[PDB]
Structure formats: C-alpha cells, structure tokens
Design a protein around this ligand. Structure first.
Ligand SMILES: CC(C)(C[C@H](N)C(=O)O)C(F)F
Length: 366
C-alpha cells in the first residue's frame, strides 16, 4: 500500500482508501486528475457542477460537499449552489441523462442524446457531451465507492468501516469450475432475483433502480453484451470524441478487472479470476448486460447471499449501505479485499452506464 501518502493527510479520505490498491490507484488518479484538474472541453466550474449533479443522485454529500468547494475555489458562480434553476440551461438539459446513468442506464435512448445535441442557444458538442458522461458516470461510481467503503467527510479515522470456514469451501467451488439455451434462462433468473439539502441539484429525486410504478421487482431489458462491448465499440467512440480520457478509461477498466494478488483471504497461491468474473458479470447482470459465454449459475455458486446484497446495494442504492451490511458478508475476508470488491463493482457499473449511453450516441449518429 501507499502508506506514506495515505497518512500524509494531504489527499482526501477517498483517495486514501484507494491507496490500499496502488495498481488501481494509479489508473484512478490519472482519470481523476484529468476530469477535475486538467484542460478539456468544459470549464473547471462546469466539470465541478456536473460532478455535483451526479453526486446528488445518491445523496452523496462527500462528493457534493467536495465539488461544491472546488466549484467555488475555481470561481464558479456561487449562485448555482442555490439549485439547478440558477444553473445555465445547457447544464440542466443534463439532468435527464444524469438520472438515467445513475439509476436505469438501459433507458438511455437516441432521443435523450438528440435532446442535448439539438442545435439551440447553448448546445452540447459531442466532445463536451462525452466529457460530461464520463464526469457523471465517474461521480456515480465514486458515490458507490464512498458509501461502499464507509468513506468519511473530512470536516470536524478516514473510513467508518475499513481501518488503515466457508472460505475453503469457496476455494473448492472455484477449483471445480477451473478444472473444467438454459444459459439464457439462468440470466433472467439472476437478473430478476431481488435484494437532504442536495435535492435542489436534481430532477425526480426518488427515481431509483426499482420501479414503484409497476408491481413486482425491477429487471431491466436483457441486452446481449456483444452487440456493443467496450472493447469493440465504446472505447473507439470515446477515443474519437474524448481521446485524452478514452485511454484512461480503457486503462482503469483493465486495471480493476485484472487486479489480483492471487490471495483469497487467508490463502496465498490462488487464481481468483473465476470469482472476480462472477462479481463483474453479476453487476452487469443487475444493469442487464448478458455475456453469452457465461454460465450465470456460477454467480450463486461463488457469490454468497450477503455479498450479493452489499454489491447490489452499493451498485443500485449506495445511499442505503451500512456498517452491518458491510461486515455481514465475507466475514473472514481481509478488509482490503472488501475494498477490492468496491473497485470491481464501481468500474463494472460505470462501464455499463457508459456503454448504454455510448450505444445511445452511436444510435443517434446513424
Ligand atoms: C477475491 C478478491 C478478494 C480478489 C483477491 N484479493 C485477489 O487477489 O484476486 C476480490 F475478487 F474480491
């Protein structure tokens, strides 16, 4: 870990906890320095205010307070802190797509995109729009991480949760798998399986993953992953429209997926990719992405009930994550590994939210 930096306490609590995984932290920092503290299509103030709007969706005062203050240090019109109504209209057209990216990103559709790029008084460029989707999706994923890891605000420990044998059954069930049409059905099962200043920076403040305008549970339309992967499509679209951070996203996703230490709590010497794949592929399943190679039954085999709850809660309702919830799962796993799960899920989530919105753009582009 980056002990010296972490306890320097010249970087915020969020960044401290990321330090627990230096190989992720580097890719994390590059994107964060970029989005918030480097040139690019939108002015600093706008990038910080966009960050507020995304953070607001999960009532995440860590990121809202933070960005309010950056917005202010960077000479933002302090009147925008009184609510969206005072923001410029261009920045408010973003609310619809902000909401959806946060909660139901599968609902993003060419019309939503065509709304922004609709040539009017102040219009979004694709360059600007892409930066904003990266900004929105980033502060969402960082809201997950913030509640997920119990990250504490700076104003007066750096988390209320981290603090800087079924385990051997799990290692067995991993073994068997690595030793090796109803796959379309197992997906539909797993997907359907069910588990206040800020308000003036949002629309529809109660819109969430779950729909309370329909009886029964929420399950998003199944989407065949390989109609529009990051690898084949979304990356290419971003490096054409927001190159300087297209690569930093492809690098971050790569860094989170492939981050292993070959450790699985007590044990050295293990290949965990099966288990990592299962966390990844599940979270995508929660947002409706079905990979046609995956035996989606591997999920229930490998991810315990409490993990799935925490994961889904951090992904879909991070506001509602709690200490109980945090300890209740993987009782015997190291804290660091708890944090690792957060990395996996934030990147998995961000990628889905993006991919839906990129696909939306690629649709309006035709
Ligand atoms: C299983 C775990 C903890 C990863 C593990 N620390 C590893 O080294 O691969 C992660 F996938 F949650």
């Amino acid at each position: 870990g980056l002990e010296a930096l972490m306890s320097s306490g010249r970087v915020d609590n969020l960044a401290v906890v990321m330090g627990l995984h230096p190989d992720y932290f580097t890719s994390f920092w590059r994107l964060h320095y970029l989005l918030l503290h480097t040139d690019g299509p939108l002015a600093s103030s706008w990038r910080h205010y966009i960050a507020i709007m995304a953070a607001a969706r999960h009532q995440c005062s860590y990121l809202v307070g933070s960005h309010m203050a950056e917005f202010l240090q960077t000479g933002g019109d302090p009147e925008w802190l009184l609510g969206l109504h005072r923001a410029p209209e261009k920045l408010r057209k973003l609310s619809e797509i902000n909401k959806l990216l946060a909660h139901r990103p599968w609902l993003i559709t060419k019309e939503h995109i065509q709304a922004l790029l609709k040539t009017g008084e102040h219009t979004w460029s694709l360059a600007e729009l892409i930066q904003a989707l990266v900004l929105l999706t980033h502060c969402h994923s960082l809201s997950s991480f913030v509640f997920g890891c119990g990250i504490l605000p700076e104003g007066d420990p750096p988390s209320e949760q981290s603090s800087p044998r079924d385990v051997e059954a799990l290692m067995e069930r991993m073994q068997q798998l690595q030793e090796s049409e109803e796959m379309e059905s197992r997906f539909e099962l797993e997907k359907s399986e069910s588990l206040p200043d800020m308000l003036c920076f949002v629309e529809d403040p109660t819109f969430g993953y779950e729909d309370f305008t329909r009886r029964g549970a929420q399950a998003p339309p199944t989407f065949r992953a390989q109609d529009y992967t990051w690898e084949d499509h979304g990356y290419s679209l971003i490096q054409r429209l927001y190159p300087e951070g297209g690569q930093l996203l492809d690098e971050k996703f790569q860094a989170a997926y492939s981050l292993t230490y070959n450790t699985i709590a007590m044990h050295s010497g293990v290949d965990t990719s099966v288990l990592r794949r299962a966390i990844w592929n599940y979270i995508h399943c929660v947002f409706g992405i079905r990979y046609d190679d995956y035996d989606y039954g591997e999920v229930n085999q490998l991810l315990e009930r409490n993990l799935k709850v925490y994961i889904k809660t951090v992904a879909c309702y991070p506001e509602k994550t709690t200490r109980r919830m945090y300890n209740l799962f993987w009782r015997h796993f190291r804290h660091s590994e708890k944090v690792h799960v957060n990395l996996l899920l934030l990147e998995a989530r961000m990628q889905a939210a993006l991919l839906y919105a990129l696909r939306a753009i690629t649709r309006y582009m035709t």
